[PDB]
Symmetry: D2
Amino acid sequence: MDFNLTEDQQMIKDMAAEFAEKFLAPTVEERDKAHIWDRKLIDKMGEAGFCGICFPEEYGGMGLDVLSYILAVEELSKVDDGTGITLSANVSLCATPIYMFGTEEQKQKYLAPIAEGTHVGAFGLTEPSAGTDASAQQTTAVLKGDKYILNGSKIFITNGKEADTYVVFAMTDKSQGVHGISAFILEKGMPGFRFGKIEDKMGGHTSITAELIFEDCEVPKENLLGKEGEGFKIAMETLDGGRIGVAAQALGIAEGALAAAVKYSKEREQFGRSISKFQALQFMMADMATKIEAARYLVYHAAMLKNEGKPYSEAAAMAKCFASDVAMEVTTDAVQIFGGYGYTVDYPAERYMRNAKITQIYEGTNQVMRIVTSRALLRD
Amino acid sequence: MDFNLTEDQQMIKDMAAEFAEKFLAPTVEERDKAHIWDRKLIDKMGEAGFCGICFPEEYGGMGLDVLSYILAVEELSKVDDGTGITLSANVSLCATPIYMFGTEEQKQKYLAPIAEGTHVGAFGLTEPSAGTDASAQQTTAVLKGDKYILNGSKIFITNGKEADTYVVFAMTDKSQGVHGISAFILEKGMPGFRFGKIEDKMGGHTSITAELIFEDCEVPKENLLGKEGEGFKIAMETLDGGRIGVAAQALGIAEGALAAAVKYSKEREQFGRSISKFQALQFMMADMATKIEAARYLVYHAAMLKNEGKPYSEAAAMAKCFASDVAMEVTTDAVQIFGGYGYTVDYPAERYMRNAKITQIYEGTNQVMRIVTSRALLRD
Amino acid sequence: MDFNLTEDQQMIKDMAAEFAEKFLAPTVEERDKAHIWDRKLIDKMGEAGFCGICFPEEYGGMGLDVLSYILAVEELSKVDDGTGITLSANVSLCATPIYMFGTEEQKQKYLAPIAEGTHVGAFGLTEPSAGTDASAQQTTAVLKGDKYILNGSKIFITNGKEADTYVVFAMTDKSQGVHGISAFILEKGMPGFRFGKIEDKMGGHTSITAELIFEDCEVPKENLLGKEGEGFKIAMETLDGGRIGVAAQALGIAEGALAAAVKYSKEREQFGRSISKFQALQFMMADMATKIEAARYLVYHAAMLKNEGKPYSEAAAMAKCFASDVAMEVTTDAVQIFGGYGYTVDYPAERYMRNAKITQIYEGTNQVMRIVTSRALLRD
Amino acid sequence: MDFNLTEDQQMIKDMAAEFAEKFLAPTVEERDKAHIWDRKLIDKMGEAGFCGICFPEEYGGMGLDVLSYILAVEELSKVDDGTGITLSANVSLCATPIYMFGTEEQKQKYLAPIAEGTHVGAFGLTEPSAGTDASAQQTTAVLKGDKYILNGSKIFITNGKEADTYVVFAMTDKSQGVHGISAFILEKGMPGFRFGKIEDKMGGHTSITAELIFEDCEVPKENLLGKEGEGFKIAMETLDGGRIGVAAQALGIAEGALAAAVKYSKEREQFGRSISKFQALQFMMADMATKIEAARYLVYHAAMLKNEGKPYSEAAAMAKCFASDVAMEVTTDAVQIFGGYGYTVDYPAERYMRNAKITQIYEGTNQVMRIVTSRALLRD
Ligand SMILES: Cc1cc2nc3c(=O)[nH]c(=O)nc-3n(C[C@H](O)[C@H](O)[C@H](O)COP(=O)(O)OP(=O)(O)OC[C@H]3O[C@@H](n4cnc5c(N)ncnc54)[C@H](O)[C@@H]3O)c2cc1C
Ligand SMILES: Cc1cc2nc3c(=O)[nH]c(=O)nc-3n(C[C@H](O)[C@H](O)[C@H](O)COP(=O)(O)OP(=O)(O)OC[C@H]3O[C@@H](n4cnc5c(N)ncnc54)[C@H](O)[C@@H]3O)c2cc1C
Ligand SMILES: Cc1cc2nc3c(=O)[nH]c(=O)nc-3n(C[C@H](O)[C@H](O)[C@H](O)COP(=O)(O)OP(=O)(O)OC[C@H]3O[C@@H](n4cnc5c(N)ncnc54)[C@H](O)[C@@H]3O)c2cc1C
Ligand SMILES: Cc1cc2nc3c(=O)[nH]c(=O)nc-3n(C[C@H](O)[C@H](O)[C@H](O)COP(=O)(O)OP(=O)(O)OC[C@H]3O[C@@H](n4cnc5c(N)ncnc54)[C@H](O)[C@@H]3O)c2cc1C
Ligand SMILES: CC(C)(COP(=O)(O)OP(=O)(O)OC[C@H]1O[C@@H](n2cnc3c(N)ncnc32)[C@H](O)[C@@H]1OP(=O)(O)O)[C@@H](O)C(=O)NCCC(=O)NCCSS
Ligand SMILES: CC(C)(COP(=O)(O)OP(=O)(O)OC[C@H]1O[C@@H](n2cnc3c(N)ncnc32)[C@H](O)[C@@H]1OP(=O)(O)O)[C@@H](O)C(=O)NCCC(=O)NCCSS
Ligand SMILES: CC(C)(COP(=O)(O)OP(=O)(O)OC[C@H]1O[C@@H](n2cnc3c(N)ncnc32)[C@H](O)[C@@H]1OP(=O)(O)O)[C@@H](O)C(=O)NCCC(=O)NCCSS
Ligand SMILES: CC(C)(COP(=O)(O)OP(=O)(O)OC[C@H]1O[C@@H](n2cnc3c(N)ncnc32)[C@H](O)[C@@H]1OP(=O)(O)O)[C@@H](O)C(=O)NCCC(=O)NCCSS
Ligand code: NA
Ligand code: NA
Ligand code: NA
Ligand code: NA
Ligand code: NA
Ligand code: NA
């Protein structure tokens, strides 16, 4: 065992902290208040290399490991976890399945520009009737000549509308149920592909979330990803990695919130002393700091297993569930530490608390995480 | 012991439910989104008699009991807790200290118009340096002829700016510390009394919260409330009752959130069944329901103690602490039960959760509540 | 609403506190250490009237209400909850179903001596294969002439072996499943009725818990309780009341533990001050005191509904679940407040903690309580 | 970062598991019930090499690393945590301060026999008036010729009476307070060194805990450990490592309890299915498993920091606080999963739960852990 970062991991973490400080921090308050997803900023992140950390240089990336990428999502999320989830949807939800399942032709066409920073990616699985029950897909894809024709819709898609490239799931054979689903690579601008509602959320205001609509959408036949009927496996494998990303986002949001409260507590005086001198607040901040350290190693262990080519599905679900629960509890108390000031948008705590709640829900709810963990635990 | 409501209590509960259904529920979503405090709606509430429930008929009230009033606060808060806290601040924070410490002339002039529903009230204690440490007042009042001249400011005042009548605290003799504070009745429009920042908050969007500014503000000598030096006592007694109101608010919020979640869980299907058929969700909802019932009796007991003329400070601190913690836990799980939908403003859950958080902070934070409770526990 | 005890309720509470102080407190430590269930003490309780509080004078009781009885279980349980559960099994689990379902002849024969204090009662439902799944009864009863012949066994029976009178459940018609069970009144000393294992438990050392064994046990036909096939309804109705008893036991154990820790904390000094001066311990004791008050009114509301002849099954399950969870959490922290001393049998905290855990399990586990509450919540 | 065990670590883990299976598991139930600390079994442990794992070969040890030792403590504690804490006190509390502050002659005389497995060690800091306030030492040591003469006593000493070698703390200059404390190596059999009460505890029945009494106890001058006045530093450094041992103990306890509960849940049927098929129990077990994994990495990180010669006091306090809270929550739910059976000594759950509680108190209570953590968090 070795708990030390590698030189590459540390370098990536430092690069991310520098990016966040220069490009995210000065504007996050304003962008949050105004609900802005700023594509020029997102482009600057992509140009700085973040989307290609963990992909081979032969596909436009840096050739580094999973944990370096996870560190960057965490570090960005300390400051602007809306940008953090933007990066994670790009890498874990879109690029990864193209990397894992795509032909060489698809990897060069679609993965490389995401890794290089040019293209934003999204993952279209969730439908009105298929959320947790993700296999209950009603979007259809029917092969007609040299095209699949897609009909349906997806909802709540991170980077939706603005993404260039989508990995979408549709039924090619309803009678084969979970074995009837296939994955497709779509481009923004394809015939019959349009966007619907942009969601107005509790939080995540610097992340864009949109409906996708397919009305006889024409998808070239070669943009089938993997084999017909492999789509569920692709979705589940992708989500196993994306849960590590969300875990990292939650970790960063928790760390951001605690760092803010610590600093406030040392500055704010009541009863002629800093509030950090009251033992109940000391103990609350001790518990916050402890839960965060405990979450951190779950997230890191999952990343490492993935990098080592070992099973990581259970580890990822554990990390996701624990980190997101931590973020919710930490951020709730960080608002408390600020007092009345914490309930106002002029201070940073309320943004962290609002943004924490979604970590418990997306990429699979924490109820799903517990299903995954208990299945693994209770297997013969 | 008798857990049944009196006829008067049940009638007021019903009138509140009917008012909330007709006047609050149709517009609360749009008012929250737009951050609207609608004076004409508040006026309809006053005209219906809500602000006079627990005041004698000789002061324009209905002559009923404290719990009846508490039940109305709770009922309104099931639907629109910004309106609930507006009521509670009118009644518990402004009207009540005038009723309890005012001369007959001050009650006729200032209490009756609140009880009759034409005037909105507010309570100005908190300062930038005096939050939890409420006795650290820097606002001064200096008697000059037939006026006290006030200088200072107050922050985070519920119903501030909009309110017509204010009970405000200022140092008349700083060298006497906690014994040098006095209370004054202010009117909107007094020279030198203006309003500052209107806070932009995480929630409570249908409640108004404002800074008060006093710049040689001229207050009639006869608007001293109680004796000089009695102000801190007036503040603390007022807050004891105010805590019951906040508790009732939190209780309504939790109940509104649970009821939304129950209903949704019966209607929403995944895996071929209503989500209410999954045991983990059943248990979460059982726990929500149970916590709410436990909180309810704490709130009603505090209200009954106050109505019986018994000590209720500790009871009110317990109820407030408990019910606000329950509201926070319940609303956070109610969002969870709605899944992704829950994180969107088109469903009701996110508003309850945002609104719950402030119940843990205002009218004394839950740390203060635990100081008050522990001091009573540990006394002698 | 009225939260005041009646004069009778207060009198009963005072009688119970006096009994506990005189007869339980001086010996509970010794009886716990030695695992003694002292029948002479149990007889003194019965002679003092506790078993007959809530039964009509025409059946040997005092003619008072359910809550008076529940207060006595609570008060006894502050001091010796082993004796508390002994009383509760006597009254709620044995006497009550004879009262509710018995013929006049059975009430005079079997209820009256329990109400009068002469006879100890027990309730025999649980089998090795039927715990939570209580309908899965394998003990059989077959009518042969003027006797039912019983074969099987029960496990974990409170007051087993030492009880005089048992209400036992057996299948009279396995093919009718839950509608095939019947209830029988047994006497200690009946042919073919013997006792097996006396359990060695984590706690509850002043309560006796035994196996019952039936080997062609001959039960007079008139000792059928209710009608053939009504046995499950009798069991469930009985347990609805017994859960209020357990709730009361848990409440008392919580109160006992907190009272002990409060007193210790005011006496024990470290760092030149009483440990009650450290804000983290103040807040822990505030939370304990708050949770106990919240539990109390759930328990009392359930008792009151039962007394008023209203549905009380959901209320009882709520009270049981919440009070027992409270007792577990409170007692765990009360041991913490004592420090090292708390881990030793010379101080009282460790007995309260060990005895709290069973409250979450018997009379139906808290998982069952949540099933009952969520069914009630989610019903159409 | 590397989450894999080294070959040495895995070998020690395996040797510990094999030792526990062959020597502890067959008798732990009977030893716990009888409150047996079996010196000959402790001697077998020493002979196997467990007490020397992390000491140099020149002092009779194996020459391996801190985590290897920690892994052995954890593994033993899965089965018999009384034996685990016996080991930890031998190693972390007695052997280590001799290793870290002893002269070469004191290490050969006193360290090597522990590392070789023939001598048992103990650490005598706590006094009746000096628990959490450890610097408030009343035991005195007065140099008289070639002896220090010791007067006082110690309470709650793990391995006391049985131990052969003791590191004990006494005031050599009371007017220097925390700087007037010195450390001494004592042997069982020194004139004036006797033993007092052997504690009767809630749990830890296979660990011995005793009072030490010094009545003009004669200690060779050369048995001063470190310089005069350095004692408190020696104590605090020793406790930092000791906290890792307790953390590892708690971790083993939780793991042993979860594994028992998992296995049982797969075997026990109610309602026609294994209880592991009910979702609420699945989620409870997922949560147990997740908390244990989160705690594990805190413990291993603390151990690695110590092995790397880095600061580890805060890491060890976090690990201890977290793992002991996890053990308490896990063991309490493991009892729950066994139902009524769980409350009986014939099943393993109740012993784990009783034993978990002391991990929250000894080697510094979890309140101390939060002081240490908060002080490091809030530093500057
Ligand atoms: C901001 C945001 C971004 C999103 N991003 C994406 C995206 O980029 N791509 C994508 O495809 N999807 C996306 N989603 C959709 C998201 O993954 C789903 O919301 C989530 O899977 C839950 O589905 P649902 O909302 O339909 O809730 P439902 O599945 O209806 O769940 C409702 C509740 O029931 C519980 N539940 C359901 N089934 C069970 C069960 N068997 N046992 C126990 N409890 C159960 C759930 O846990 C939840 O608490 C996003 C959602 C949001 C809010
Ligand atoms: C929406 C809103 C409405 C409001 N309405 C009103 C109103 O109508 N009238 C009015 O006069 N005021 C009002 N307040 C102000 C409110 O009561 C205060 O915010 C609250 O008392 C906390 O004061 P503070 O914000 O200065 O925080 P601080 O007093 O600075 O507290 C910050 C943190 O330190 C903790 N803390 C402080 N002292 C201690 C201690 N001794 N021990 C342990 N922890 C401690 C607090 O609990 C809190 O967690 C309102 C505030 C808000 C946000
Ligand atoms: C000290 C003591 C005294 C007792 N006194 C009496 C007495 O006087 N009379 C009497 O008849 N009985 C008595 N009992 C028996 C007691 O009620 C049962 O132990 C209890 O009902 C649980 O049954 P079980 O122990 O078989 O656990 P099981 O039913 O095997 O339960 C094991 C676990 O599975 C959970 N579980 C089971 N089914 C489900 C489900 N559908 N969903 C979710 N979780 C589930 C349980 O909650 C528990 O956590 C006593 C027990 C004890 C320990
Ligand atoms: C089984 C057992 C084995 C032991 N083994 C050893 C051993 O081998 N060697 C050894 O020297 N000692 C040993 N101890 C003693 C143990 O470390 C102490 O019990 C522990 O430090 C607490 O001290 P105390 O019991 O006096 O409680 P106190 O110090 O009296 O504490 C009582 C309560 O007050 C809290 N508290 C105290 N001060 C504060 C504060 N400033 N702020 C907040 N809360 C506070 C504590 O956390 C605790 O909850 C052992 C104890 C036990 C029970
Ligand atoms: C609930 C959950 C775990 C399982 O659904 P369920 O309907 O029970 O599916 P299962 O029966 O477990 O799996 C069906 C198939 O998928 C496979 N599968 C499941 N998880 C897998 C994984 N991690 N890797 C590979 N295959 C997997 C199964 O092995 C099975 O295939 P075979 O029968 O070919 O072996 C899944 O639907 C899910 O993860 N839902 C949440 C979806 C989500 O996270 N959405 C987020 C969108 S982006 S915010
Ligand atoms: C923290 C808390 C409890 C105590 O502050 P502290 O500085 O310790 O004040 P204390 O020493 O307890 O009391 C000072 C005086 O006030 C009195 N006092 C305190 N609470 C009282 C009460 N409930 N009723 C009457 N008098 C009270 C005390 O008796 C004492 O008077 P004497 O010196 O004449 O005996 C108090 O300042 C408080 O409640 N703060 C939170 C403020 C708040 O709730 N703001 C909400 C604004 S509206 S959202
Ligand atoms: C799990 C639980 C709630 C339900 O079991 P389940 O197998 O689902 O039974 P259900 O189907 O709910 O009920 C079956 C019958 O009993 C009836 N019933 C259930 N609860 C009832 C109640 N409180 N009052 C009257 N009837 C009741 C049902 O109405 C149904 O009868 P009909 O079909 O005649 O209407 C029950 O078995 C139970 O309480 N188990 C715990 C047992 C226990 O508490 N033991 C403690 C022993 S003393 S320590
Ligand atoms: C409460 C706690 C943290 C601090 O007590 P406190 O009285 O505040 O002591 P402090 O002021 O922090 O420290 C006093 C001195 O000890 C030193 N000290 C404290 N922790 C230290 C550590 N981990 N390493 C080295 N020195 C330390 C301080 O640096 C200070 O020295 P200087 O004055 O020379 O700078 C300490 O007494 C403690 O750990 N108590 C629990 C005891 C315990 O764990 N008992 C278990 C027995 S075995 S089961
Ligand atoms: Na989905
Ligand atoms: Na903010
Ligand atoms: Na009622
Ligand atoms: Na049963
Ligand atoms: Na005890
Ligand atoms: Na690994």
